[PDB]
Amino acid sequence: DNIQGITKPAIRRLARRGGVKRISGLIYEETRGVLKVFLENVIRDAVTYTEHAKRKTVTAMDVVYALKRQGRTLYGFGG
């Protein structure tokens, strides 16, 4: 379903922020395959905090706690 929610131009305008000039016609599928790996190494480690404290609601602190563990610390939400 929703892996094709992140469309072609929204992957395109991400890469223009990175400073690329001409994207090939194959990155638009490869990026979808390397983003859904990244969300399954965060949400899998963000449910586990939410499941721990007996809550059914993944709050914003637990995500920052998940991203902190694998070296991608995120500011601007709590710590």
Binding site: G18, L74, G76
Partner: protein, 103 residues
């Protein structure tokens, strides 16, 4: 008579001296250690916020929006090594086009 203004800082010292006691970093902390740590926290926050205003001044604004911390952190060699891993929420990125992509 407070404890910070005995040493003349701005970060609190009573608020730190419970967090080296109720985080279990160790059991006993010295009396000078929550003073010495409120200085090094000050000297870094007085280092970014010096550099934060210069991006606010060069871009002609008044408040420091989160974009201005991104230029302040990532345009200093001495402080980007301290924060080479972290990101910033809605920080943007530097203007950096490569050399060969120019016309």
């Amino acid at each position: 008579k407070s404890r910070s203004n005995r040493a003349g800082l701005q970060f609190p010292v009573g608020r730190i001296h419970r967090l080296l006691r109720k985080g279990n970093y160790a059991e006993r902390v010295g009396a000078g250690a929550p003073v010495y740590l409120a200085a090094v926290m000050e000297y870094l926050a007085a280092e970014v916020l010096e550099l934060a205003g210069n991006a606010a001044r060069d871009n002609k604004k008044t408040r420091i929006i989160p974009r201005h911390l991104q230029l302040a952190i990532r345009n200093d060699e001495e402080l980007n090594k301290l924060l080479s891993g972290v990101t910033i929420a809605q920080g943007g990125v530097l203007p950096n086009i490569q050399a060969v992509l120019l016309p």
